[PDB]
Amino acid sequence: ARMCGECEACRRTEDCGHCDFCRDMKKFGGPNKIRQKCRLRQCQLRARESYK
DNA sequence: GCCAACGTTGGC
DNA sequence: GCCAACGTTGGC
Ligand SMILES: [Zn+2]
Ligand SMILES: [Zn+2]
Fold this sequence. Notes:
Elements: H1 8-11, H2 20-24
The structure holds zinc ion (2 copies).
The chain binds a DNA duplex through residues 1-2, 25-26, 32-37, 50.
Function: Transcriptional activator that exhibits a unique DNA binding specificity for CpG unmethylated motifs with a preference for CpGG.
Binding site for Zn(2+) 2: 16, 19, 22, 38
Binding site for Zn(2+) 1: 4, 7, 10, 43
């Protein structure tokens, strides 16, 4: 839907820890104000263009 | 009950 | 139209 499930981004299991979306996550110390997937896990086909 | 990450929205 | 922010809820 937002995932094709077979590109590199869809197959990734590990958040990069360094992009703006990761730095937002509570797991990396952020405020959880943004709340999107890691930039490297944004489906290359289906994701909003601005999320890649 | 919590939570990942989606779709919606307000302010620009 | 963009995008920061956050209500939402399927899945756990
Ligand atoms: Zn990342
Ligand atoms: Zn994909």
